[PDB]
Amino acid sequence: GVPTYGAIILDETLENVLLVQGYLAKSGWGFPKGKVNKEEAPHDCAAREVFEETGFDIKDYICKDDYIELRINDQLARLYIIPGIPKDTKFNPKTRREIRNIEWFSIEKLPCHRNDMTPKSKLGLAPNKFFMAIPFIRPLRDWLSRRFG
Ligand SMILES: COc1ccc(C(=O)N2CCCCCC2)cc1
């Protein structure tokens, strides 16, 4: 996998995070992110994908050591943490061919794992519209507890 870069944007209260909704195979809700171009530095990729998908430019707010990174089936995804963005910010994606909707979600209400179907004696996981975000939720909560209490 070519690495992906993006951001976890929080509001002023630190209660809420900004998610985006795509289409088709990406039809659920996730953190904004995308694939790095040849020769493009990580911070530049994160800013460009977040600006294409949200309309908001994070370049002046990125902190180099403040991010959460995960490897999932051999693709690396790194999300820079960006606190303190006002809830009344006007977000407007660039390509509406990729992004259906943009919303704020309460962190404490988001799932941190999918649910089994052991009520039905059936293997696997039940569908969840937050599937792209879920892996980052527990590591975010733990990062926030350490930096802020
Ligand atoms: C393999 O390349 C990828 C690139 C980006 C994403 C991703 O999460 N996106 C893109 C748009 C859909 C909505 C959520 C944000 C996933 C995979």
Curated annotation (Swiss-Prot):
Tissue: Expressed in brain and testis. Not detected in heart (at protein level).
UniProt PTM comment: Phosphorylated at ser-249 in a MTOR-dependent manner.
Entry's family note: Belongs to the Nudix hydrolase family. DCP2 subfamily.
Lineage: superkingdom: Eukaryota
Protein role: Decapping metalloenzyme that catalyzes the cleavage of the cap structure on mRNAs. Removes the 7-methyl guanine cap structure from mRNA molecules, yielding a 5'-phosphorylated mRNA fragment and 7m-GDP. Necessary for the degradation of mRNAs, both in normal mRNA turnover and in nonsense-mediated mRNA decay. Plays a role in replication-dependent histone mRNA degradation. Has higher activity towards mRNAs that lack a poly(A) tail. Has no activity towards a cap structure lacking an RNA moiety.
Descriptive protein name: m7GpppN-mRNA hydrolase
Subcellular compartments: Cytoplasm, P-body; Nucleus
Consequence of changing E53Q: Strongly reduced decapping activity
Span of the annotated motif Nudix box: 34-55
Binding site for Mn(2+): E49, E53
Assembly and binders: Found in a mRNA decay complex with LSM1, LSM3, LSM4, EXOSC2, EXOSC4, EXOSC10, PARN, XRN1, CNOT6, UPF1, UPF2 and UPF3B. Forms a complex with DCP1A, EDC3, DDX6 and EDC4/HEDLS, within this complex directly interacts with EDC4/HEDLS. Interacts with DPC1B. Interacts (via N-terminus and C-terminus) with TRIM21 (via N-terminus and C-terminus). Associates with polysomes. Interacts with LIMD1, WTIP and AJUBA. Interacts with DDX17 in an RNA-dependent manner. Interacts with ZC3HAV1. Interacts with APOBEC3G in an RNA-dependent manner. Interacts with ZFP36L1 (via N-terminus). Interacts with NBDY.
Domain Nudix hydrolase: 1-131
